[PDB]
């Protein structure tokens, strides 16, 4: 193996090192928004992020020890939760805004350009506000994102037991981070719970976003890339 023999510190470094870059959108400000163009910007951006996400996953300790079939399944389940957790993280220091790309910061009012999308923006904006309240740290963020990759498809597929041992290592890593930040034992278990409970809300938003995306596919508002389509059709 390898993943199970990492120190908490080594886990954190591995995860940090694996972080994908923040990509720019092709947003042209001399181009008035329409439902079709905003949807095109957002899905073109997502499409490019997925290529980096697939290569990030390869670097999450334990992931490549899984079979190709299992890797595919995990990514199919979690891809939108992962894009969304990245988005909210990026948006954390911009209250009222979603920072899809450094050159594309959107208001809820801007979300109204696309039918059904504003309710998703609101949920994402609220998650960002929660991250802000809790003062989420970058080291905590990379652990949570890796937890999502490994957890989200784990009960809908032995090496399954391997996944849970790696999950336990990441839990151990979060606690180590919290002990090192000076939290008491009580505070450590309480913050641990607070962080994992937001994953429930991230799942919820992913569920809702997936239904919104599919409704846009059926409405034929904008051409979906082939990878995005396959990622989307894996859910129905």
């Amino acid at each position: 193996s390898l993943a199970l023999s990492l120190t908490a510190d080594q886990m954190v470094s591995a995860l940090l090192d694996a972080e994908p870059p923040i990509l720019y959108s092709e947003y042209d400000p001399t181009r008035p928004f329409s439902e079709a163009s905003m949807m095109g910007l957002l899905t073109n951006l997502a499409d490019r992020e997925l290529v980096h996400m697939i290569n990030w996953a390869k670097r999450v300790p334990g992931f490549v020890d899984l079979t190709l079939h299992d890797q595919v399944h995990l990514l199919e389940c979690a891809w939108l939760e992962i894009l969304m957790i990245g988005l909210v993280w990026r948006s954390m220091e911009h209250p009222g805004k979603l920072l899809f790309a450094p050159n594309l910061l959107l208001d809820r009012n801007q979300g109204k350009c696309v039918e059904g999308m504003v309710e998703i923006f609101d949920m994402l904006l609220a998650t960002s506000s929660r991250f802000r309240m809790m003062n989420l740290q970058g080291e905590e963020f990379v652990c949570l994102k890796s937890i999502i990759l490994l957890n989200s498809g784990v009960y809908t597929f032995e090496e399954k037991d391997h996944i849970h041992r790696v999950l336990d290592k990441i839990t151990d890593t979060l606690i180590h981070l919290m002990a090192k930040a000076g939290l008491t034992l009580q505070q450590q278990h309480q913050r641990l719970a607070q962080l994992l409970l937001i994953l429930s809300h991230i799942r919820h938003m992913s569920n809702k976003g997936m239904e919104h995306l599919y409704s846009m596919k059926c409405k034929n508002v904008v051409p979906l890339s082939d990878l995005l389509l396959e990622m989307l059709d894996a859910h129905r």
Partner: peptide
């Protein structure tokens, strides 16, 4: 095999 499959294999 799907796109995700080959990108993961690369």
């Amino acid at each position: 095999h799907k796109i995700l499959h080959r990108l993961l294999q690369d």
